[PDB]
Coordinates of C-alpha atoms and ligand atoms in Angstrom, one line a residue:
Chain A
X1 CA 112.9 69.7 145.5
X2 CA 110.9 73.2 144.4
X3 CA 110.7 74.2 141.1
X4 CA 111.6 78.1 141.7
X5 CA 111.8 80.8 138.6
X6 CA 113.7 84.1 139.6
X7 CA 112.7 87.6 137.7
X8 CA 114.8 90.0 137.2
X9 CA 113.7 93.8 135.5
X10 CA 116.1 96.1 134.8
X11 CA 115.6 99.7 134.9
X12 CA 117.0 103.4 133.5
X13 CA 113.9 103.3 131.6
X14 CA 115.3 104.6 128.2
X15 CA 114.0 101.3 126.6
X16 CA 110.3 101.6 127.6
X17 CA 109.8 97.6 127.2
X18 CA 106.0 96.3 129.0
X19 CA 104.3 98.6 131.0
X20 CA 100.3 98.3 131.2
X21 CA 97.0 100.4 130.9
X22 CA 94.6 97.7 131.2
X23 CA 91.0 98.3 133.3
X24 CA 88.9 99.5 130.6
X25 CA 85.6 101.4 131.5
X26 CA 82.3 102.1 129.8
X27 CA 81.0 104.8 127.9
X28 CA 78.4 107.8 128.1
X29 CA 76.7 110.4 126.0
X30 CA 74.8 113.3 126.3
X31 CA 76.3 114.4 129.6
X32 CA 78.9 116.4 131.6
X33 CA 81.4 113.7 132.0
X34 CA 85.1 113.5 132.6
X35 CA 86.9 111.5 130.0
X36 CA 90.9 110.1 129.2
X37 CA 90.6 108.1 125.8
X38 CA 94.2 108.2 125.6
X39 CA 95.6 110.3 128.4
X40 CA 94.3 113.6 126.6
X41 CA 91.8 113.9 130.0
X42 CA 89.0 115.9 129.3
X43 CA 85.7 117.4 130.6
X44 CA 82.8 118.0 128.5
X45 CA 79.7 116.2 126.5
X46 CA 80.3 114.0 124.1
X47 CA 78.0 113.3 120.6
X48 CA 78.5 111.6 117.7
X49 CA 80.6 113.4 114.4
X50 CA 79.6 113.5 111.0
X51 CA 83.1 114.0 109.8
X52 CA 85.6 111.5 108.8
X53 CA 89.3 111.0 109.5
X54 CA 91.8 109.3 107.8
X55 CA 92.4 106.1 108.6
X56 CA 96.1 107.1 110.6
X57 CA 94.0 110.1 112.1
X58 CA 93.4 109.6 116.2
X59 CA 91.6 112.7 117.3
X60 CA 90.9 116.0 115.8
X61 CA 91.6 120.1 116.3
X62 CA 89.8 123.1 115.1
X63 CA 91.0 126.5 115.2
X64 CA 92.7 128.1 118.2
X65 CA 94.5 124.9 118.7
X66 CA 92.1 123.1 121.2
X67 CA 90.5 119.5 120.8
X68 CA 86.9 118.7 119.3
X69 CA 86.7 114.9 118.3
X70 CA 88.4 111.6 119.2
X71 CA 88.4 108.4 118.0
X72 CA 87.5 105.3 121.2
X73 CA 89.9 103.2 121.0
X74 CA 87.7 100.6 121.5
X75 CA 85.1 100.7 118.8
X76 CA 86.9 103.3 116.5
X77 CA 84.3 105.4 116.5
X78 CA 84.9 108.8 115.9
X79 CA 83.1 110.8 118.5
X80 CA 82.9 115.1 118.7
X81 CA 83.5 116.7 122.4
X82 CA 82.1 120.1 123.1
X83 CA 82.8 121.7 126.4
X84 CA 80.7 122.0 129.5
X85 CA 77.6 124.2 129.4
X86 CA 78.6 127.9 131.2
X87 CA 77.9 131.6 131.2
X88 CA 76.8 134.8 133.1
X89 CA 74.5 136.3 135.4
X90 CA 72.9 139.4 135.4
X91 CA 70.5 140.6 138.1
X92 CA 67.6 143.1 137.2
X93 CA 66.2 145.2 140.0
X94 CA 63.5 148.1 140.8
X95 CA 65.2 150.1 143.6
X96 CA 65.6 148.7 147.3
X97 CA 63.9 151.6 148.2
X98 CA 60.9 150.5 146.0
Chain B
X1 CA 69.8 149.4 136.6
X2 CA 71.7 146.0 135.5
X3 CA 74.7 144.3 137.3
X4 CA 76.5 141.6 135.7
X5 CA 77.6 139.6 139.3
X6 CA 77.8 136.3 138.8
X7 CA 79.3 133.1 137.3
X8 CA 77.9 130.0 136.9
X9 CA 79.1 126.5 135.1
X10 CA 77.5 122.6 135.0
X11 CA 80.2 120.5 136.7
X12 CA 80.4 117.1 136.0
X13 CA 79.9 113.6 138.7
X14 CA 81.2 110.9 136.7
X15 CA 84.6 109.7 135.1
X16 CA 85.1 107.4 132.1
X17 CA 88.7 105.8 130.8
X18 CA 89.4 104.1 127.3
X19 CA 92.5 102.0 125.7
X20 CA 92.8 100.1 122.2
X21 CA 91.8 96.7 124.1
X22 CA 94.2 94.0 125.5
X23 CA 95.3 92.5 122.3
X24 CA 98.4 91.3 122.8
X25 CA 99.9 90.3 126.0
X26 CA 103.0 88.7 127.0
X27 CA 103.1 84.9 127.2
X28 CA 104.3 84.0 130.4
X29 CA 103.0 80.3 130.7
X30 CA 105.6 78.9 128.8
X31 CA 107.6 79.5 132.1
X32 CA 105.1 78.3 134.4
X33 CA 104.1 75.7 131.9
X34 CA 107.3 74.4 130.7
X35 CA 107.8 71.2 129.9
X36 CA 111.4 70.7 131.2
X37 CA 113.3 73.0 133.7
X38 CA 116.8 74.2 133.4
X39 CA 120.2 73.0 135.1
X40 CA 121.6 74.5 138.5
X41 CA 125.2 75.7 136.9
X42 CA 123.6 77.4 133.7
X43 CA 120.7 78.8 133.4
X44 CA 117.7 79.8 130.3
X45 CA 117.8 83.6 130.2
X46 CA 114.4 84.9 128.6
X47 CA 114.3 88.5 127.6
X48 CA 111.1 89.6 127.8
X49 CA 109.6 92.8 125.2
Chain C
X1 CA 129.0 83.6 99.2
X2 CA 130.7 87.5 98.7
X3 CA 130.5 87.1 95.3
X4 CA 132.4 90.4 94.7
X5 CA 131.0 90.9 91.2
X6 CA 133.7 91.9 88.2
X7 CA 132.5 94.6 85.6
X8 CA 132.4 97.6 88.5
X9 CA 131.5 100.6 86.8
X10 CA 132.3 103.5 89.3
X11 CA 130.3 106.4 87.9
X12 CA 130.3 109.9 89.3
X13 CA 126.9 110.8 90.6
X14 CA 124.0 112.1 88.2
X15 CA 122.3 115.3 89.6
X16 CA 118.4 115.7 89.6
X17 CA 117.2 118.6 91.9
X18 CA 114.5 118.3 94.4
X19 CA 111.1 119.1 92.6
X20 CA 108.7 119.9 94.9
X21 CA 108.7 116.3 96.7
X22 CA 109.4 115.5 100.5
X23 CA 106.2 116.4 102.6
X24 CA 104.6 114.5 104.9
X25 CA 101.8 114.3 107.5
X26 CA 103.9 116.4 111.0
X27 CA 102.1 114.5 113.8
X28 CA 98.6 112.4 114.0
X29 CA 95.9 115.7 114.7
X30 CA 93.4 116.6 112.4
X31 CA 92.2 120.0 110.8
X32 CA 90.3 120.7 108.1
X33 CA 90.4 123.6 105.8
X34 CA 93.0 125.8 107.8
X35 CA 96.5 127.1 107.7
X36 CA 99.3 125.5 109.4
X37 CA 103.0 127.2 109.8
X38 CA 105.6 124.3 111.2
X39 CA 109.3 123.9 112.0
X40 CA 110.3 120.9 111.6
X41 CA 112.4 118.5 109.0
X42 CA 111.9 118.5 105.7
X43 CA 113.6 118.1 102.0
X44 CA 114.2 121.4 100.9
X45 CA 112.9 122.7 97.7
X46 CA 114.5 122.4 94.5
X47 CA 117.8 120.6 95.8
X48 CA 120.4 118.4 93.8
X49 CA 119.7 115.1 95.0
X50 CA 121.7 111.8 93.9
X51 CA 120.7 109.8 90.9
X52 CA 121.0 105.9 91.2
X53 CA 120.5 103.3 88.7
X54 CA 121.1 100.0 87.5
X55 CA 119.9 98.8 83.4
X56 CA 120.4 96.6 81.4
X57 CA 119.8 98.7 78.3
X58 CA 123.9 98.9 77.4
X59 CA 125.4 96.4 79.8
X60 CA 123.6 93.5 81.2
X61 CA 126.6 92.3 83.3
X62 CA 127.9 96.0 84.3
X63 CA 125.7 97.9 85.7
X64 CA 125.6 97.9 89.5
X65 CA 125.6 100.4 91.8
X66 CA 125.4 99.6 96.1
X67 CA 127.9 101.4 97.7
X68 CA 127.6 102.7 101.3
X69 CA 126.2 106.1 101.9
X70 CA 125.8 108.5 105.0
X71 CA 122.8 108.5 107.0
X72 CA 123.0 112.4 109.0
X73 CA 119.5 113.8 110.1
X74 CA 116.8 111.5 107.3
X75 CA 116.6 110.9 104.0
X76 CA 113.5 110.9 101.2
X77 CA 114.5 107.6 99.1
X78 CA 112.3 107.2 96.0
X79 CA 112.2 104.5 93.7
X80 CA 110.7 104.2 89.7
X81 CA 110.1 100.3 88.7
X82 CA 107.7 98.1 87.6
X83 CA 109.6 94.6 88.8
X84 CA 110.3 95.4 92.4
X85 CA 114.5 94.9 92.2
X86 CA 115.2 97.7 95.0
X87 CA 113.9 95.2 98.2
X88 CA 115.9 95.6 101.3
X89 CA 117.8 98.1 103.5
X90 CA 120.5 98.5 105.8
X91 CA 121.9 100.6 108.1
X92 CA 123.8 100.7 111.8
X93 CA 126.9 102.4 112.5
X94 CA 129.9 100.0 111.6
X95 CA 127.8 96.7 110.1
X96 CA 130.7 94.0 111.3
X97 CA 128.4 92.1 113.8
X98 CA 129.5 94.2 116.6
X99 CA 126.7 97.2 116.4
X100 CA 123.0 96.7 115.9
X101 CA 121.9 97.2 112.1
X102 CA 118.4 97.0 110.4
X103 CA 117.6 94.6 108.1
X104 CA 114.6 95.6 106.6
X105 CA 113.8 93.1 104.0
X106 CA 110.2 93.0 102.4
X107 CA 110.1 89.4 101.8
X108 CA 106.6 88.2 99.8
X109 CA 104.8 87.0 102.4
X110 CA 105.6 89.0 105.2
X111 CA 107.7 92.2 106.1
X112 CA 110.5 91.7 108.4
X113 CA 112.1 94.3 111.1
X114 CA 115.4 93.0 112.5
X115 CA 117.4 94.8 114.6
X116 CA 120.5 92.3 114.8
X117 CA 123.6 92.2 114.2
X118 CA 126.0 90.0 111.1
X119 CA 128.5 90.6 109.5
X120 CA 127.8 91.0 105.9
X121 CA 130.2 91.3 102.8
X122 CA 131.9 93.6 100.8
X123 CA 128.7 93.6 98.6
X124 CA 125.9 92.1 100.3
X125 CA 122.9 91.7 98.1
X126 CA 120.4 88.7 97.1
X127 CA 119.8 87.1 93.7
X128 CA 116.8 84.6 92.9
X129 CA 116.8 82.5 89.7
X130 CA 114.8 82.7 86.5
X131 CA 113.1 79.4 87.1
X132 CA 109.4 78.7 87.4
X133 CA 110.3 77.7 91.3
X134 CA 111.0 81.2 91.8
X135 CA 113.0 81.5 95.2
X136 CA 115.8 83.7 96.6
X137 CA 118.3 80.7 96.1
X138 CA 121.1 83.3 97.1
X139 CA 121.0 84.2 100.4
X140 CA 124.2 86.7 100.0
X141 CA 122.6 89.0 102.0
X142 CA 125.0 87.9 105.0
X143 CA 126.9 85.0 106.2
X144 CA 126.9 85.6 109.9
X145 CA 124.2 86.1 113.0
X146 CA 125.5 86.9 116.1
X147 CA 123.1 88.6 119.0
X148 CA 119.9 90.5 119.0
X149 CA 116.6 90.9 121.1
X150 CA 114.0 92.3 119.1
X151 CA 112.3 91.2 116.4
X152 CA 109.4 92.2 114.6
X153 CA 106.9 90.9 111.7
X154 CA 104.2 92.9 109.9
X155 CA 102.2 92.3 106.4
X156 CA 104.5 93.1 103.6
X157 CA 104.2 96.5 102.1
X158 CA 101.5 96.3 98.7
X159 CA 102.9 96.0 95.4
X160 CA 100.8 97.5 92.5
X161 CA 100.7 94.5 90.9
X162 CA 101.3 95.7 87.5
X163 CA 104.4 93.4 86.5
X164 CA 105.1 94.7 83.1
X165 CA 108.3 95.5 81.3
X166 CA 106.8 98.9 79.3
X167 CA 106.2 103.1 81.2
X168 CA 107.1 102.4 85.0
X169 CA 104.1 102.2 86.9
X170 CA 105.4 101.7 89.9
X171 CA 106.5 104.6 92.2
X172 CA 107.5 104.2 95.9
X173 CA 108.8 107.3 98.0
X174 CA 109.5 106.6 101.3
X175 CA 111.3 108.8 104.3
X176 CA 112.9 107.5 107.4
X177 CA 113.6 109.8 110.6
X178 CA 115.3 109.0 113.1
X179 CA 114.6 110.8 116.5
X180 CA 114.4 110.8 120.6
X181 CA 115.0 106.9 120.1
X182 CA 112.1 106.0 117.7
X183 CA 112.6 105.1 114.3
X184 CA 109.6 106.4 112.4
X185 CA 109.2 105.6 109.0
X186 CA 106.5 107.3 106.1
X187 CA 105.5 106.1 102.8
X188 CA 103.4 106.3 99.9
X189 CA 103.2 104.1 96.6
X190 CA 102.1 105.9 93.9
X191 CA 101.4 103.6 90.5
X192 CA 100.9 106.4 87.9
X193 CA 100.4 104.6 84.7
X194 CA 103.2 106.4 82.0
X195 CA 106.0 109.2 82.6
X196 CA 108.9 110.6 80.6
X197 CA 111.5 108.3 82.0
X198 CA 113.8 111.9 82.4
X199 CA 113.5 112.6 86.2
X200 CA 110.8 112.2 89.6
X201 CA 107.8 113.1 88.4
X202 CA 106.8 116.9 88.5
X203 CA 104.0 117.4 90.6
X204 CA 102.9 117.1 94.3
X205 CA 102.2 113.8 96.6
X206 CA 102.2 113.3 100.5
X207 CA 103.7 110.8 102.8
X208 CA 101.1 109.4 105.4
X209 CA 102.6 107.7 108.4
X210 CA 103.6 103.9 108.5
X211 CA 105.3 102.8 110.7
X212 CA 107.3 103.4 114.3
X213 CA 109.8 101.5 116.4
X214 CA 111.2 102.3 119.9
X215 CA 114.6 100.5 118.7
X216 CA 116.4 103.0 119.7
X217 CA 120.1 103.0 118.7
X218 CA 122.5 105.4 117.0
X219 CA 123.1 105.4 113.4
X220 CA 125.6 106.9 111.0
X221 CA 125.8 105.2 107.8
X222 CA 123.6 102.5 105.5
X223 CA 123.1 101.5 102.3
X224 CA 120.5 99.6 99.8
X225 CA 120.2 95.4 99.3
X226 CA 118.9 94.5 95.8
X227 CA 117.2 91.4 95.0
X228 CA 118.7 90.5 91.3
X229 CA 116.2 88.3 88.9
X230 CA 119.2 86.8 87.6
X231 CA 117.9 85.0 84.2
X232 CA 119.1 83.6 80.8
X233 CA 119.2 86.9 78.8
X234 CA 123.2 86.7 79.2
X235 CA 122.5 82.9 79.8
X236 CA 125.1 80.8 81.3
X237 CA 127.2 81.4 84.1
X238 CA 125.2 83.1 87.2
X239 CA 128.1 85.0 89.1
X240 CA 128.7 86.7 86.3
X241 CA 126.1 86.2 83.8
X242 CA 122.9 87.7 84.9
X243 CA 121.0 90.8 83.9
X244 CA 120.6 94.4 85.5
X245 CA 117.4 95.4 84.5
X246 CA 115.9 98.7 84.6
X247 CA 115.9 100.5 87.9
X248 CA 116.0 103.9 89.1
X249 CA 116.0 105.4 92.3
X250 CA 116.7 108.9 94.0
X251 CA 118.4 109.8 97.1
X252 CA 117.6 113.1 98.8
X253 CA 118.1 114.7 102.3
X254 CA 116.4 116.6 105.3
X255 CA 116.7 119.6 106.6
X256 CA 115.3 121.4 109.5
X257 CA 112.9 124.2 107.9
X258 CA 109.4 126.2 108.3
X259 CA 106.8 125.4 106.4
X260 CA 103.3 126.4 105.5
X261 CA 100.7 124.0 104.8
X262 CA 96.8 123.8 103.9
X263 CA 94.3 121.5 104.5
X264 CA 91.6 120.6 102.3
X265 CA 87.3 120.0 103.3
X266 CA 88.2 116.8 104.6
X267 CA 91.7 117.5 105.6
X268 CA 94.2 116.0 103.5
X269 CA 97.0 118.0 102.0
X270 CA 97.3 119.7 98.9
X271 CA 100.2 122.0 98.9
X272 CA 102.6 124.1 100.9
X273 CA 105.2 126.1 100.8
X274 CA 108.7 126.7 102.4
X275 CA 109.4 130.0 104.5
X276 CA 113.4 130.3 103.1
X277 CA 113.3 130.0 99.2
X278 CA 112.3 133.0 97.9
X279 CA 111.3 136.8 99.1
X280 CA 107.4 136.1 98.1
X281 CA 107.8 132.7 100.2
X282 CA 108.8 134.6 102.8
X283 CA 106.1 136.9 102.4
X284 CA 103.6 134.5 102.2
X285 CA 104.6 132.7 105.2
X286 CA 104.9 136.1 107.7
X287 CA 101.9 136.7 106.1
X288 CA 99.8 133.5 107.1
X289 CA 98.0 133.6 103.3
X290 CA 98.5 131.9 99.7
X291 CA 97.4 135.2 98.7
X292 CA 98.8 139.2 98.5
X293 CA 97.6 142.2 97.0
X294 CA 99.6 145.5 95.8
Ligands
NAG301 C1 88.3 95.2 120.8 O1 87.8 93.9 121.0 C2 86.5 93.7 120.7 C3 86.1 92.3 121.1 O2 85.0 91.8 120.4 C4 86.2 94.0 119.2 O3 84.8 93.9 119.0 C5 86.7 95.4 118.9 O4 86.6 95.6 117.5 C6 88.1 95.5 119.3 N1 88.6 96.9 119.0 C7 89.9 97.1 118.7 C8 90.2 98.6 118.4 O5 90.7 96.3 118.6
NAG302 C1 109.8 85.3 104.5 O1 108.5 84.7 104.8 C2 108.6 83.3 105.2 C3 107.1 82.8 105.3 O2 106.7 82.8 106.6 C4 109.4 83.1 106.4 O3 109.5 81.8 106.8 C5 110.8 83.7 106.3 O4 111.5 83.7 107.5 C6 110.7 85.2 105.8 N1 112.0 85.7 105.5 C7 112.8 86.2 106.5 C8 114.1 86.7 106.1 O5 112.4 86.2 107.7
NAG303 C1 86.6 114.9 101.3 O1 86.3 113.5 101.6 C2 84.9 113.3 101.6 C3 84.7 111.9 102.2 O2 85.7 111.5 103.1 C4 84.3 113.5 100.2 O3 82.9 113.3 100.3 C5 84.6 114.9 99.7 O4 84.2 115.0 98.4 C6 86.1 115.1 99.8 N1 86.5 116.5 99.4 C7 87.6 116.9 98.9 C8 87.8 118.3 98.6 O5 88.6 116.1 98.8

């Protein structure tokens, strides 16, 4: 005799029922890293925030509609994002002919 | 004179991910683990959520 | 047992309209000091909601009211106590342990979500006795349980622990939506101390968000399950000889509307404003501002 267990999932995925994120990773600061605390991917630098949520608060907006702090799930910790460092070149010059 | 040419950005190298822990999980060793096993004809049906 | 009480005074409905109650936190993002113009449900201002209400002022042994009522697009339940006699729900579509229906009782010790079926009586309620062992002796909530497959348990929702007889410090308002198969529920408990026992309070509140479930299952229709402190001020007999208190609780309903809201330093609400009530709401709202000039 074998001692046998047969699983059977269903599927049409209107009841959303187990799933899994798992593999957590670690955390930076100070640097131009890519980040998904919840699925809400990212790129910038993150840095601490002064400010505090409510307790049912998850992350934060300012105006224009775009994100600027999110609690880790992890710690709960609420950290401030600010986007990557950018901007323009201008190019002085005497004359070729000089 | 002035020419305003070119744009530059810092790009980043490095990728980090985050989720509210493991804290609850489904117990599945009460399966594997069980203390007595079910009949031919008939069966336990666990739903599982 | 269906106990199906004697003494039924059928009442038509008292009227009380909607003072400036029924808003709540949208979604789970953050702002702080800005102006926010959203579409979404809501209570409407100043609307005639229903008046429930069960005392024992006049009739100790008479005055019950748990009928059935219709559950469309949400409703802002609110109760004014200070004994905790409203403390279950109901709802499903036609409750005779054939369709899914949601029991939630709140228990003492722990707050229970069933989604199960039973099939539950004319007038389902629970009753406790007076004595010092003090214990829902009556479960009449149902008699039968069929099939289910999700259960759930939580830490019952806080009492104010102010269990006096005298002004109604207790005040629970509580709204329950139910879309894209979650069933999300909002609440607030708000103690106050004394209030002119006329109406809901006349002021403003907000309903942070409590709890959600990925149930997912049609509903229709519901009703109310009131746990009865049945004692010896009509002492005696315990079908009919009990007491009904003093409870009162309004029933409003939602609405899909636009509405402007602010946000204070640290970003809790203070007050908004519907965009359909009057020409200077309207104003206010295309104009994105609490203030106009000439
Ligand atoms: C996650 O688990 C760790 C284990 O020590 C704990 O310190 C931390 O507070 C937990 N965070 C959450 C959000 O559960
Ligand atoms: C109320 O709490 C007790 C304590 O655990 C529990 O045994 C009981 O099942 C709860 N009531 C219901 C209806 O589940
Ligand atoms: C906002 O909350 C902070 C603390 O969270 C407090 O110091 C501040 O006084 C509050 N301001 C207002 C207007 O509520």
């Amino acid at each position: 005799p074998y001692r046998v267990v047969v699983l059977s999932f269903e599927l049409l995925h209107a009841p959303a029922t187990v799933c899994g994120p798992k593999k957590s990773t670690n955390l930076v600061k100070n640097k131009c890293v890519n980040f998904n605390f919840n699925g809400l991917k990212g790129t910038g630098v993150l840095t601490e925030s002064n400010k505090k949520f409510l307790p049912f608060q998850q992350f934060g907006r300012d105006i224009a509609d775009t994100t600027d702090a999110v609690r880790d799930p992890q710690t709960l910790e609420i950290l401030d994002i600010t986007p990557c460092s950018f901007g323009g070149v201008s190019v002085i010059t005497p004359g070729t002919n000089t | 004179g002035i020419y305003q040419t070119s744009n530059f950005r810092v790009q980043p190298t490095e990728s980090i991910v985050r989720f509210p822990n493991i804290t609850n999980l489904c117990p599945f060793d009460e399966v594997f683990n069980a203390t007595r096993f079910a009949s031919v004809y008939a069966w336990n049906r666990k739903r599982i959520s | 047992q269906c106990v199906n009480l004697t003494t039924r005074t059928q009442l038509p409905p008292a009227y009380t309209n909607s003072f400036t109650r029924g808003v709540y936190y949208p979604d789970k993002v953050f702002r702080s000091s800005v102006l926010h113009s959203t579409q979404d449900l809501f209570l409407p201002f100043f609307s005639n909601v229903t008046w429930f209400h069960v005392i024992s002022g006049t009739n100790g042994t008479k005055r019950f009211d748990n009928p059935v009522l219709p559950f469309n697009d949400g409703v802002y339940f609110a109760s004014i106590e200070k004994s905790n006699i409203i403390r279950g729900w109901i709802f499903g579509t036609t409750l005779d342990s054939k369709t899914q229906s949601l029991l939630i009782v709140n228990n003492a010790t722990n707050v229970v979500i069933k989604v199960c079926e039973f099939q539950f009586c004319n007038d389902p309620f629970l009753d406790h006795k007076n004595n010092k062992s003090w214990m829902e002796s009556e479960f009449r909530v149902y008699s039968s349980a069929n099939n289910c497959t999700f259960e759930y348990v939580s830490q019952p929702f806080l009492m104010d622990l102010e269990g006096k007889q005298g002004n109604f410090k207790n005040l629970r308002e509580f709204v329950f939506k139910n879309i894209d198969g979650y069933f999300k529920i909002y609440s607030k408990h708000t103690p106050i101390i004394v209030r002119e026992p006329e109406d809901l309070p006349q002021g403003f509140s907000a309903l942070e968000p409590l709890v959600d479930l990925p149930i997912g299952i049609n509903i229709t229709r519901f009703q109310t399950l009131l746990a009865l402190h049945r004692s010896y001020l009509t002492p005696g007999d315990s079908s009919s000889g009990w007491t009904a208190g003093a409870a009162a609780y309004y029933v409003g309903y939602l609405q899909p509307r636009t509405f402007l809201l602010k946000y204070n330093e640290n970003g809790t609400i203070t007050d908004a404003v519907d965009c359909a009530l009057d020409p200077l709401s309207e104003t206010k709202c295309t104009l994105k501002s609490f203030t106009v000039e000439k």
